[PDB]
Amino acid sequence: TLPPAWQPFLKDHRISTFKNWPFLEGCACTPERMAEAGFIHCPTENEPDMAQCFFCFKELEGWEPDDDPIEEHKKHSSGCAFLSVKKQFEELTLGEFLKLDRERAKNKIAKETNNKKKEFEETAKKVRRAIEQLAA
């Protein structure tokens, strides 16, 4: 077993998050194929095909049986470092690895910022709207 906050780094871990995933045998975007691509299942009650790259925290919905999780990812997140990582886990130098666990945590933080933002703008729109209704 490895320290919990590092499992995501481990494919079989990822695979294991897809529970009740629907695109299975025959589909191009099976849990397995999602996993080699970096996704983890984050099903919302209102978003049950919700999945994100454990590294570059991008989320994605709208999965069709024909969807290649890889080229999808390079489309919507071209600058994910994971994607340039061509070595299995154990084949990496703790150096190489500790460096990536560094982008991840940085990337993570940059996503919680562009999220606090998006939640600020949202609240502004409602303050604005509300003012206009009180000016008529």
Chain residues binding a second copy by CB under 8 A are 2-3, 6, 89-95, 97-98
Q: Candidates 4-12, 18-26, 36-44, 114-122 — which segment interacts with Zn ion by CB under 5 A? A: 36-44
84's CB contacts (< 8 A; 6+ apart) are none
Phi, psi of 51 (to 5 degrees): -140, 135
Q: Does 53 bind Zn ion (CB under 5 A)?
A: yes
Going by C-alpha positions, the residue among 20, 33, 25 that lies closest to residue 71 is 33
Which DSSP letter does residue 127 get? H
CB of 13 to a second copy, least distance (A): 14
Q: Candidates 8-16, 62-70, 79-87, 94-102 — which segment interacts with Zn ion by CB under 5 A? A: 79-87
Question: Contact residues for Zn ion (CB under 5 A)?
Answer: 38, 53, 55-56, 77, 80, 82
